């Protein structure tokens, strides 16, 4: 009896602006927005996501959680792709981009209730963004000299490792800074060519022990057993190592060479042939001086028997991605053939031994001085398997921030933990009354959108919302008897859980936010909110 009208296209789920579609797109993002509000910060909390392979994984970082979650809302995918901009191009800000872009949509609802068009809302944030980016250059107090000293790295690395597994930031900083200093080459007065690489640091973990038992070794550590009677080599420097791509087996012919079984006379020649040929091929390898054979593929049974008599260490690396980074260490080259270990393709390694890590015997591949390697390894120990997963991800986010220390303003710094976000509010409201026109509504709401960062830090810390907020306002707004504003601009949101009262300077704990992370996160947060506010209509289908 009731007819149907308003949908002229096809059967689908249709959304129009007359139904408040701009509110529905924000409400759909708000469902996943509250998850990231409790993530960022040292007091943040961890979420459990069961993988499709039947494995429970828990992590603080949102960029990893957004990949494991199934999101059918395309408006959320805009922030997911914006989160990838924080994970790929930068090493920090994955948790911050979801809070800022989510709040820009919340403060935009007040402008929608007043009837303001989405274009003037976007134009208001674009004018307010240039006002903020201009101030970010003046918000920098100190600058890292990029000395690459171990003590200097502990200043930048400590806040990056923070906001995950709080309390371990002091131990994990010494492990990361020691590995980064080994990858960084020794050079002076050259800023043109980049040096540090993210993949140059490979992190390993083994159950058993504790976090204090971890160490830092120069090289690429392998967890596999030597598989043969030779457990380790001697302490003599420059051991010749051969990398073979072809598996260890009887030598074949490049042209045809197909083995077929017909008569029992051929079966005896196949068994006796593999004994004579492999013994002949492995002998020519040992005659040239090769004491170690790295086989990317499997190793036969007869190959392990003859190499034990020649005193050659057997090493198997089933991962081909690790062999590419291994060539930068020892200098060896992979050979697709077998039986011809050319000395031009052979590398040199000073020390190859077998050590006990976490209770299990593993073969360590390392060096000391000669044959400078660009690859380092961070060894971890612990009883809990889930805790070691986030520590490796914290190191990956920690070493990725070292990549941001390069020429594009990598040394500049700004006070974090809620210190800068509050001070920018007074500067944005200063430009609100300064800029006449209808933009005053969007500029004032643009500064209110930055109040979510200190609020979430107080909510995740169990602090009262009615306490930290008025305390930060009176701390960053003062009357100084003079032209130059003085005293404390460093007041942040304190971790609390101890001590006395209120807030305090963040410089006491040597914690700050890097300008390259903060300045780039603002551009991503505005463009992520610009896309959502610019879309007033979508067309989808039932999934």
């Amino acid at each position: 009896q009731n007819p149907n009208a308003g949908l002229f296209k096809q059967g689908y789920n249709s959304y129009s602006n007359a139904d408040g579609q701009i509110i529905k797109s924000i409400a759909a993002i708000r469902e996943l927005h509250q998850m990231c509000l409790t993530s960022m910060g040292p007091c943040g909390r961890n979420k459990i996501i069961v993988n499709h392979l039947g494995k429970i994984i828990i992590t603080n970082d949102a960029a990893t959680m957004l990949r494991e979650l199934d999101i059918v809302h395309p408006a959320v995918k805009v922030l997911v792709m914006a989160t990838e901009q924080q994970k790929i191009d930068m090493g920090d800000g994955t948790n911050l981009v979801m809070i800022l872009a989510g709040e820009l949509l919340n403060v935009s609802e007040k402008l929608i209730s007043m009837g303001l068009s989405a274009v003037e809302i976007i134009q208001g944030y674009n004018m307010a963004r240039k006002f903020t980016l201009k101030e970010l250059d003046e918000m920098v107090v100190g600058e890292i000299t990029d000395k690459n000293d171990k003590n200097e790295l502990l200043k930048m690395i400590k806040p990056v490792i923070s906001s995950k597994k709080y309390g371990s930031e002091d131990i994990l900083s010494e492990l990361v800074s020691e590995a980064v200093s080994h990858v960084l080459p020794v050079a002076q007065q050259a800023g043109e060519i980049p040096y540090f690489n993210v993949d140059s640091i490979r992190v390993v973990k083994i159950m058993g022990g504790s976090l204090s038992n971890s160490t830092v070794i120069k090289g690429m550590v392998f967890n596999r057993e030597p598989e043969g009677h030779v457990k380790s080599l001697s302490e003599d420097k420059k051991h010749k190592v051969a990398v073979f791509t072809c598996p260890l087996d009887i030598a074949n012919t490049e042209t045809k060479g197909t083995v077929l079984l017909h008569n029992a006379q051929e079966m005896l020649d196949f068994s006796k042939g593999e004994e004579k040929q492999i013994d002949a091929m492995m002998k020519e390898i040992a005659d040239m001086g090769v004491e170690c054979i790295v086989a990317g593929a499997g190793v036969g049974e007869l190959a392990l028997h003859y190499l034990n008599r020649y005193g050659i260490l057997v090493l198997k690396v089933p991962s081909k991605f690790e062999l590419r980074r291994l060539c930068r260490v020892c200098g060896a080259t992979p050979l697709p053939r077998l039986g011809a270990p050319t000395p031009e393709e052979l590398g040199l390694v000073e020390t190859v031994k077998t050590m006990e890590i976490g209770g299990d015997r593993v073969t360590v591949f390392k060096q000391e001085q000669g044959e400078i390697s660009r690859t380092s390894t961070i060894i971890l120990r612990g009883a809990t398997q889930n805790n070691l997963d986030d520590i490796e991800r914290a190191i990956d986010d920690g070493v990725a921030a070292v990549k941001g220390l390069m020429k594009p303003s990598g040394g500049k710094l700004l006070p974090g933990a809620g210190a800068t976000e509050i001070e920018l509010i007074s500067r944005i409201t200063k430009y609100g009354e300064r800029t006449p026109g209808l933009l005053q509504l969007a500029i004032k709401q643009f500064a209110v959108a930055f109040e979510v960062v200190p609020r979430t830090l107080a909510e995740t810390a169990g602090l009262d919302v009615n306490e930290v907020l008025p305390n930060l306002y009176a701390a960053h707004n003062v009357t100084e008897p003079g032209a130059v504003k003085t005293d404390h601009l460093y007041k942040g949101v304190d971790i609390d859980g101890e001590s006395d009262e209120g807030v305090k300077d963040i410089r006491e704990e040597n914690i700050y936010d890097m300008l390259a992370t903060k300045k780039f996160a603002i551009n991503v947060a505005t463009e992520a909110a610009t896309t959502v506010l610019s879309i007033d209509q979508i067309i989808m289908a039932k999934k």
Binding site: M114, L116, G437, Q440, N466, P470, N477
Partner: protein, 518 residues
């Protein structure tokens, strides 16, 4: 039944917003018409704000509280009823996310509204301008606010003269720091009471000082006009006195029955001799007078007047000086008919009247309204009371405030400046007060049809650097100054508007729980 927790705070804000939702377009001179559908099939098309609210039946008790608070404002002042509800309704709307979503304690908001109310009254005193209360030409353009858009607009010049004559008579300065100072001390209720006179012209309406009575001479042959009448007031009427209980007179003697009939004539005559002891020229009786007492007082040369209300005798005593006495035998000689200009009974409108008017002010007056019909008299009656109410509003507070959304926006600009120096948790709900102060000028814009976003941005900018003299014109709709067109309202209306709004907003925030049952 019963609603506890935060759900009652949601319903209290929703009920206040729902009642204000009706009167949103009922504010301002451009307010449009509403259609009320009655369950019996009736309709009310009147656009009056306070006239609709009395006919609206509401369920939630917080909605009933807004009707009771508006009823008190309707009796104190004639206009501005919808101004308080809309202002108090927007305070709860702007503070709605702060009370719940921001988890702010309600008393903190209530205490912030108390500090915002004190700061608002200080800004109203700063934006107010002095006005001369003794200027007759200045009071005409003020009182006209309650005149125009009515049938009395043609007589408005004469309507202001009738209003000022009554206010200037009942006002007492008495300025001093000894016993306390009422400002001009105006009483409209008791002294300014008006009696409508049929017939005549509206231009002939004058303000008489005295008491007017409709009852004429009660005897066919008697002096109609007395040069200097001497008033004598009394309670018990003139007739044979009888007991308040059952009286049974049993006389077994023959000739004593004729003596009782003579006492009945002597008892009435004795009551007339006690009145004539002071030799009055006029006799005014509250109740009726028997025909026997009419002949006794006729030989004494005094007029007899019966059928006078008790409320008049209180005013008759003050315009004359005759002391009201209960028993006629107890009548004191202190009764005087002095300060009485004329007794003239001259007929107006085919009905004989009685005039006590004199040339002096006995701390009272009687307004004589004449017109071409009784419907015009009833229209002038209510309009004159509202014209004097606005006049009383100007006299009590010797200052004027800019209208047309100028005062509402000017306070919000000052509230935003005082919010930066507060430095406390109350700063967030205190900024919501200024946002609610901007809804009243936005209300006039939505009723005018202009763009609210474009005008409020320009309107707020003209208050800071324009000395807050720039309002919004209703007829045109372009943002203009209020000094040119001369739109001004007394401060006491702006004072009671923000005072009741905070009291109405806090009262709904004070109730967090609603229960039922007897």
């Amino acid at each position: 039944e019963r609603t506890t927790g935060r759900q009652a705070q949601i319903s209290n804000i929703t009920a206040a917003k729902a009642v204000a939702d009706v009167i949103r377009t009922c504010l301002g001179p451009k307010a449009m018409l509403k259609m009320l559908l009655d369950p019996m099939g009736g309709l009310v098309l009147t656009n009056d704000g306070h006239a609709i609210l009395r006919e609206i039946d509401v369920a939630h008790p917080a909605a009933k509280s807004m009707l009771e608070l508006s009823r008190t404002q309707d009796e104190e002042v004639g206009d501005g009823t919808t101004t308080v509800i809309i202002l108090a309704g927007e305070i709860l709307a702007q503070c709605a996310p702060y009370l719940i979503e921001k988890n702010i304690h309600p008393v903190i908001i209530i205490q912030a509204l108390k500090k915002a109310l004190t700061d608002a009254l200080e800004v109203i005193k700063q934006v107010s301008k002095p006005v001369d209360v003794e200027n007759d030409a200045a009071m005409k353009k003020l009182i006209q606010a309650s005149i125009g858009t009515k049938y009395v607009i043609h007589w408005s010049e004469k309507m202001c003269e009738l209003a000022l004559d009554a206010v200037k008579t009942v006002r007492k300065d008495l300025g001093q720091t000894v016993e306390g100072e009422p400002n001009f001390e105006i009483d409209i209720k008791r002294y300014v009471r008006v009696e409508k006179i049929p017939g005549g012209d509206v231009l002939d309406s004058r303000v008489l000082k005295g008491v007017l009575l409709n009852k004429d001479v009660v005897h066919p042959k008697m002096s109609r006009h007395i040069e200097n009448p001497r008033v004598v007031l009394l309670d018990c009427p003139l007739e044979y006195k009888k007991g308040e209980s059952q009286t049974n007179i049993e006389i077994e003697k023959e000739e004593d029955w004729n003596r009782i009939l003579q006492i009945e004539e002597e008892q009435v005559q004795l009551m007339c001799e006690q009145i004539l002891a002071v030799r009055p020229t006029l006799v005014i009786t509250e109740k009726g007078v028997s025909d026997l007492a009419q002949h006794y007082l006729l030989k004494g040369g005094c007029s007899v007047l019966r059928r006078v209300k008790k409320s008049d005798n209180n005013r008759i005593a003050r315009v004359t000086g005759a002391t009201i006495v209960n028993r006629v035998e107890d009548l004191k000689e202190s009764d005087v008919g002095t300060n009485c200009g004329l007794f003239k009974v001259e007929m107006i409108g085919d009905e004989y009247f009685s005039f006590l008017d004199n040339c002096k002010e006995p701390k009272a007056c009687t307004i004589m309204l004449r017109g071409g019909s009784k419907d015009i008299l009833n229209e002038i009656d209510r309009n004159l009371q509202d014209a004097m109410a606005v006049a009383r509003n100007v006299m009590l507070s010797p200052s004027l405030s800019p209208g047309g959304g100028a005062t509402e926006m000017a306070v919000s600009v000052k509230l935003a400046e005082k919010a930066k120096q507060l430095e406390g948790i109350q700063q967030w709900p205190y900024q919501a007060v200024a946002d609610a102060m901007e809804c009243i000028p936005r209300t006039l814009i939505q009723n005018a049809g202009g763009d609210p976003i474009r005008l409020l941005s320009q309107l707020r900018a003209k208050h800071a650097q324009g000395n807050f003299t720039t309002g919004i014109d209703g007829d045109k709709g372009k943002i203009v100054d209020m000094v040119s067109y001369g739109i001004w309202e007394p401060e006491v209306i702006k004072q009671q508007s923000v005072k009741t709004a905070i009291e109405s907003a806090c009262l709904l925030l004070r109730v967090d729980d609603i229960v039922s049952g007897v």
